[PDB]
């Protein structure tokens, strides 16, 4: 299991590092110091999609609980940054579709739709964290949640799916399952920081001024 | 329960069979002449010619009667028509515009005048406004009906029956001798924009 | 610990009432504020847009409908304007049970009290009941149905 776990952390070290310094702001383009990135102007992800697949199928053939669904985060955020705004059509995102088959939610083809399943799947493997009993983000140690990261798991989650129901009606709809699939705050929410209960509560309320739904 | 006070009350851990006044509420049949009821009507309208100005708010002061009673025979003329009370079900309500125009067609006048209104027909140019005609109309055949103001205790009594509807709807009466048929009166009501969007998000 | 009300169609209360089992003894202490009208706001709102469509043949009884974090709501729309709602619950468990038929037979059944009240040509709308007879009846029409 030390494997796993030096695979683990290496792993998401290198994703979210080479996802934060790959097509940061890429508009303007400063090719000298290329040292850490090729940095060009047709440098957007492309290193960083293919070690974000092969660090989802070591952390598939890690086999984590709790960090294995940041592997899914990475490849969501490389579909939805590197697939969707800078993607000129390339969307590479052949072995993040091979571990949607192995890992879970496959079989879709579209844009906020495979966002929609994988954010199912990263869910549902953040729900298979049944009880990690350790620290691996070491801010805190004792004293944390994981309810602060999971609220801000299913924020990202809320704030990346509920404008795509328009507020000019007809135009890109879908079923108003959001506030039928937003209640789902039966933690407990007391106090952790209020920041964070800030930033939840106005999301939430925003979301419900968006869809025009007042009380 | 008032206004002023809070919801509060007591446990159920008793029974207080105090009761007075509650009776059935069927579909009784007396029939009365319609004489006494010309009469009624006839010094209901020398009260609102003695009282009231001019044309318009007689009008207004004319239909404010029918929106009194229009939402009471609205829901329990749909209480006997859609479904003591021993009750097997309550049907559909308003689906839209064209079953609930169907629904003073099939059943108001029905319950009211013994008859149906001969047409309910959806106008040509426009479809905020539609138009439904009585032949001979009963509660007012004997006033001469060259003033048309007469007839508005019908155009009253079915805004009434649109407004608890939620349909907001301007309702006019003008009288047309289209047939040999004459003195018959066509009530083309209008609605507002909004619920025709609502049907106009879809239809 | 039972809570009804009909809400009007500019939201106000015409008819709202608690009552507890003597097994409670009392109702949701400290927890009576927030399971009042905010909650009953938001099941106006949900019931609002969920009436006008055909779509989540009964169109009047809607069954158990919403749920916060303690309990959950259930819901009545007449087409008198009204929208009965009933708020039930022991505060302990997480009470599941909808009995979705037997309080079936009590929202068509507080009906005919509302309809005979409708009939005073005296009562307007947009003015709450204070029958000293009414709301004696309906907690002995609960009492048919706890």
């Keep these: 299991r030390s494997q796993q776990k030096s695979l683990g952390r290496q792993m998401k070290i290198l994703g979210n590092f080479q996802l934060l310094a790959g097509r940061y702001v890429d508009a303007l383009n400063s090719f000298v110091d290329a040292i850490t990135t090729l940095y060009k102007v047709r440098d957007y992800l492309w290193l960083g999609s293919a070690l974000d697949g092969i660090s989802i199928c070591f952390l598939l053939l890690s086999y984590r609980n709790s960090i294995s669904i940041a592997a899914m985060q990475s490849p969501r955020n490389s579909i939805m940054s590197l697939s969707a705004p800078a993607l000129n059509i390339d969307v590479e995102n052949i072995n993040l579709p091979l571990l949607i088959k192995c890992i879970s939610d496959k079989v879709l083809y579209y844009y906020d739709l495979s966002l929609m399943h994988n954010s199912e799947y990263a869910p549902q493997v953040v729900y298979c964290e049944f009880l990690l009993k350790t620290l691996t983000f070491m801010t805190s140690c004792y004293k944390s949640s994981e309810f602060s990261k999971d609220v801000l798991d299913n924020i990202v989650k809320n704030q990346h799916r509920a404008l795509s129901d328009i507020p000019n009606s007809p135009m890109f709809p879908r079923f108003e399952v959001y506030f039928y699939s937003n209640k789902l705050f039966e933690l407990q929410l007391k106090e952790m920081q209020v920041e964070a209960q800030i930033k939840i509560y106005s999301t939430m309320a925003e979301v419900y001024r968006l869809l025009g739904y007042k009380r | ?203 | 610990p039972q809570y009804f009300a009909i809400i009007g169609k500019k939201d106000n209360p015409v008819y709202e009432i608690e009552f507890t089992n003597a097994e409670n003894p009392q109702g949701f202490p400290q927890d009576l504020k927030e399971l009042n009208p905010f909650i009953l706001h938001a099941s106006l709102d949900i019931v609002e847009d969920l009436q006008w469509q055909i779509n989540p043949t009964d169109n009047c009884y809607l069954g158990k409908v919403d749920h916060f974090y303690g309990l959950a709501i259930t819901a009545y729309i007449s087409y008198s304007g009204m929208k009965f709602v009933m708020i039930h619950g022991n505060s302990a468990n997480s009470s599941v049970v909808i009995d979705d038929n037997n309080m079936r037979s009590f929202y068509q059944e507080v009906h005919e009290l509302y309809v005979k009240t409708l009939m005073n040509p005296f009562y307007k709308i947009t003015d709450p009941i204070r029958s000293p007879a009414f709301d004696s009846r309906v907690r002995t029409l609960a009492r048919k149905h706890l």
Excluded at chain 2, 30 to 40: D, G, I, K, R
Excluded at chain 2, 155 to 160: E, F
Excluded at chain 2, 189 to 203: N, P, T
């Design chain 2, 1 to 203: 329960v008032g206004p002023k006070q809070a919801i509060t009350s007591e446990a159920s851990t008793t029974y207080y069979i105090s009761r007075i006044y509650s009776e059935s509420l069927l579909f009784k049949r007396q029939e009365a002449s319609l004489s006494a009821m010309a009469f009624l009507f006839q010094e209901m309208i020398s009260q609102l010619h003695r009282t009231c100005k001019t044309a318009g708010d007689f009008e207004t002061k004319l239909s404010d009667y029918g929106h009194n009673i229009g939402i009471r025979l609205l829901e329990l003329l749909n209480f006997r028509a859609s479904s003591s009370n021993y009750i097997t079900k309550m049907r559909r309500r308003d689906l839209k515009i064209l079953d609930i125009l169907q629904f003073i067609h099939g059943t108001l006048w029905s319950y009211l005048f013994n008859h149906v209104s001969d047409d309910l027909v959806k106008s040509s140019e426009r479809d905020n406004e539609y138009m439904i005609v009585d032949n001979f109309p009963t509660l007012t055949q004997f006033i001469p009906g060259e003033n048309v103001s007469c007839e508005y205790f019908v155009c009253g009594i079915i805004k009434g029956f649109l407004f608890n509807a939620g349909f907001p709807c301007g309702v006019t009466a003008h009288r047309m001798p289209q047939g040999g048929h004459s003195q018959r009166t066509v009530y083309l009501i209008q609605f507002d924009r909004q619920v025709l969007d609502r049907e106009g998000l879809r239809f």
